[PDB]
Structure 1
Amino acid sequence: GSTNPPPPETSNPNKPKRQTNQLQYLLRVVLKTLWKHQFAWPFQQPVDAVKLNLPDYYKIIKTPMDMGTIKKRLENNYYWNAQECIQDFNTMFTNCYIYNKPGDDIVLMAEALEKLFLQKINELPT
């Protein structure tokens, strides 16, 4: 049998909280732009491998990540360093490349989201 894992942790009241220009930009600008993109929908929540009848997804992907979880981490002040968020976006993209194969439709879609991501963080405030 196959059960999805629990989503990644998103909120923990023991972790200290800080508001930074970079974390606010990642929420208010970057996540916003990726979220309306044409290709955002597969990435807006955890991959539901039970629904999709994919029992190997979580055999292959051991560090799940998605924009819904990133949104939550940002808005719940889970991240301390901006690079924690940028690492979660890279995990999301790379999970797609790992599970799938070069040139697959969803890989082309992830590649385009990644290109938008990189253009947006080029303008990360200091």
Structure 2
Amino acid sequence: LRLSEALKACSNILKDISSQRYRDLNHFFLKPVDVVALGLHDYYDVVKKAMDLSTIKTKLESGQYHTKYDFADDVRLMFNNCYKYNGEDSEVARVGKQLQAIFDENFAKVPDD
């Protein structure tokens, strides 16, 4: 599958925020939330659609994002899920915001579709 130039830059941004360089921030978002493994109460009462870095990579590479905004929607969904279930004073929300600020800075430089 050949990606647009905008989505190619999105792929490279995804690999950056998912890389070992940011392992202290992204390892909580690398894989789908597992309510049983994490002992979560009411997760899907609060979160209607789960999202994580592995799933965004799958969708991107299988052609499910038509524009860079479709890709950015899922990234934003991943972080907003974390903020609203865990609370912005939680440790996981605090590292999330750090990772999102990194992503926001880079995504601003992507050319139009």
TM over 0.5: yes
Aligned identity (percent) is 31
Kept after mapping to 2: 8 A contact 1:34/1:40: yes
CA RMSD of aligned residues (A): 1.4
SS in structure 2 at match of 1:42 = coil
Match of 2:48 among 52, 55, 62: 62
**1:75 maps to which of 49, 56, 61:** 61
**Per-residue CA distance 1:75-101 (angstroms, 9 max, x = gap):** 111111111100001101100111012
Alignment of 1:36-51 (within 5 A): 36=19, 37=22, 38-51=24-37
1:1-126, aligned counterparts within 5 Å? 19-27=3-11, 29-36=12-19, 37=22, 38-126=24-112
Cα separation, 1, equivalents of 2:40 and 2:46: 11
Runs of 4+ in 1 over 3 A off after TM superposition: none
Q: Do 1:96 and 1:107's aligned partners in 2 also have CA atoms closer than 8 Å?
A: yes
Larger Rg: 1
More helix by share: 2
Q: Could you tell me the TM-score, scaled by structure 1's length?
A: 0.81
TM-score w.r.t. length of structure 2: 0.89
Return 5+ residue gaps in structure 2 as ranges: none
Deviation at 1:18, TM superposition (A): 6.1
Equivalent AA in structure 1 for residue 10 of structure 2: L
Q: Which runs of 5+ in 1 are unaligned?
A: 1-16
